[PDB]
Write a protein that binds this ligand. Sequence first.
Ligand SMILES: *[C@@H]1O[C@H](CO)[C@@H](O)[C@H](O)[C@H]1NC(C)=O
Ligand SMILES: *[C@@H]1O[C@H](CO)[C@@H](O)[C@H](O)[C@H]1NC(C)=O
Lengths: 356, 362
Amino acid sequence: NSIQIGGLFPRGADQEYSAFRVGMVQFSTSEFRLTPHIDNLEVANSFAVTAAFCSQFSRGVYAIFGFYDKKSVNTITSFCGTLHVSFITPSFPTDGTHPFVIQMRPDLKGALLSLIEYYQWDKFAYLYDSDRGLSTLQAVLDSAAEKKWQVTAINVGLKKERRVILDCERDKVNDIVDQVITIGKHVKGYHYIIANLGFTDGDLLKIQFGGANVSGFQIVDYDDSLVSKFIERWSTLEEKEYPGAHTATIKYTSALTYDAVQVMTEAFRNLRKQRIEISRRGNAGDCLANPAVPWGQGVEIERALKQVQVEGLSGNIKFDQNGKRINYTINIMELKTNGPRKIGYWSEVDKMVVTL
Amino acid sequence: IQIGGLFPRGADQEYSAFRVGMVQFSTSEFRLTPHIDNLEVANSFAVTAAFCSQFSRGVYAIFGFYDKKSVNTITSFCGTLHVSFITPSFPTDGTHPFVIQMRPDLKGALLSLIEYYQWDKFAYLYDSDRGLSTLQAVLDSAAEKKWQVTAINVGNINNDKKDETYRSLFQDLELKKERRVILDCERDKVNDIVDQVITVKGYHYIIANLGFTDGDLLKIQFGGANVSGFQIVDYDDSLVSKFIERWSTLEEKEYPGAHTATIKYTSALTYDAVQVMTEAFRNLRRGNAGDCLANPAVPWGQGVEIERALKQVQVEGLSGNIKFDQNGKRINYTINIMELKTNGPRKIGYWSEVDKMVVTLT
Ligand SMILES: *[C@@H]1O[C@H](CO)[C@@H](O)[C@H](O)[C@H]1NC(C)=O
Ligand SMILES: *[C@@H]1O[C@H](CO)[C@@H](O)[C@H](O)[C@H]1NC(C)=O
């Protein structure tokens, strides 16, 4: 049988969509075929997100892979929770209890706080925007209170501070660093921490940091044989057929998208073994129906997704009962004179930066 | 003229004020016809459905509330469907069309008041359930102003992080000896949190809300601490006195939250919103939520005429001078600066949106 699934992609997310399509070929199985219904939209627009979500719902999809942002996250969590439709996402994780939301992206706050402590900072700037929520801001301020740190926290969305965390969209990093350089004051005297999971993604390291210290994080480890094999294939794909591919690296969001296909596939295999109906007809049903009478299979589908344990591009994939990644590792990177290098790792279980 | 009215469960006094406004501002020549629904504002699905049902009915505007979880539903649906939403809720950071914000921004007055007292080291007790936008404005300014801010989330008070909180508080209040403290929370949580802090005479609290005198002001007690805050409803205005003279005798069962000598600022703003809609709309069955997806948006050219009519209103209300900029933000208003004195709360000065500084009264 075929299993209907939805896809809600941001406009311009081409590599992500390519990774999605690569995933569907790679994890295809004789047991069933995934029939995706793909939409492209501005995910910052909660109305458009609602329309796309309801369109999928009326098609009777068994789960939706997609993206949200700060402006639409509440629409997703609320609609998923109401209608019992599972949403599997590489977007920023939330701390709220959110049933029916499967968050592929590991939380970064714990590793970031451990890294600050590892470098023994007690005074620094936290330059951020809200595009990935404000849980990291709160975590930094909470720890500053408890640890007696002096933090300057400025929303970027004549001072002798030299330690700087950048938790902002990739564009703003260049603008910020550029100012530092050209002020000449101790340019090599700075230490930047880049608070994202893609230290070696895109053009970040194309920035001229002028000999400053630069640290960051990475969830995709190119020393993994699993990752090495994937990149071998990925880098040889036809870019006209797979826009964003044919590259030597893959953005962490694209990696999580490919990983998401494996997780969904494993969940459906498990449901199939339990003889739970995952292909059904029929009728569209009404999204803003009253009462909201949610789907019975939804609870089992949600359960199956959260019970998945697999190894993927993003390492060990396992979730807690609230759809949050657990038991993962975040690689700690530094820009050494020869290039970016792993200096250690942070494990969700231990919650300590481990050197080497 | 049909309008929607979307009220959170428990906004009883606000609904009374709305009803009282309907009567006070009604005209033989013209009457608003409201369709009232009571909703869980923290639930974006429920907010979407209520908004869309009003859209379906064909209303000229929707009066209502949102919170940090549903504000994006409101701005997006307002902007897409071209239906004006008028609200007493927190004013948005960004600019968004088709939204009329009755509530004046507090950030500027708060920053000016911190400067006024010449603070340079203080605790900031915020709650993430309320939102962080005011906290952010303060943190942004701390850089330029040489401020040392210790920020603690008094949210998560019964929740998982309960432990870290009282630790931070203990460290700050007992160990660091902070003494200067801003409380950024719901007006009815002030009491609950101050008692926490007490468990001293030399403390100085700033209550970061627009309703200083709305709630408890003893002796609550603050234990001889200084207490300062903000008030947009001036009970010495003859407009406000007259309203209160009338409101104080309304029967409490018929008008929940009435028969009081004061009115919550959100209820004041709700009454003011009725005056605003009435002024704007002069001279210019059931609802199916599915219509949000089945029907096209109101043509922009039509919706915008209503939006502009609302934004152009200039009137005097319970909340003082009411005027809006092109983004629906209150401008040219005044916030009174209050301090709790031994004989009760007193107006010690004001902060005008035009000049943006705390001015001292004799
Ligand atoms: C940067 O890294 C160097 C090398 O260990 C260290 O000595 C320095 O203190 C770090 N911090 C800054 C701000 O440079
Ligand atoms: C508000 O005050 C400013 C500054 O005095 C004034 O110039 C402006 O005209 C006022 N705005 C309106 C809409 O009256």
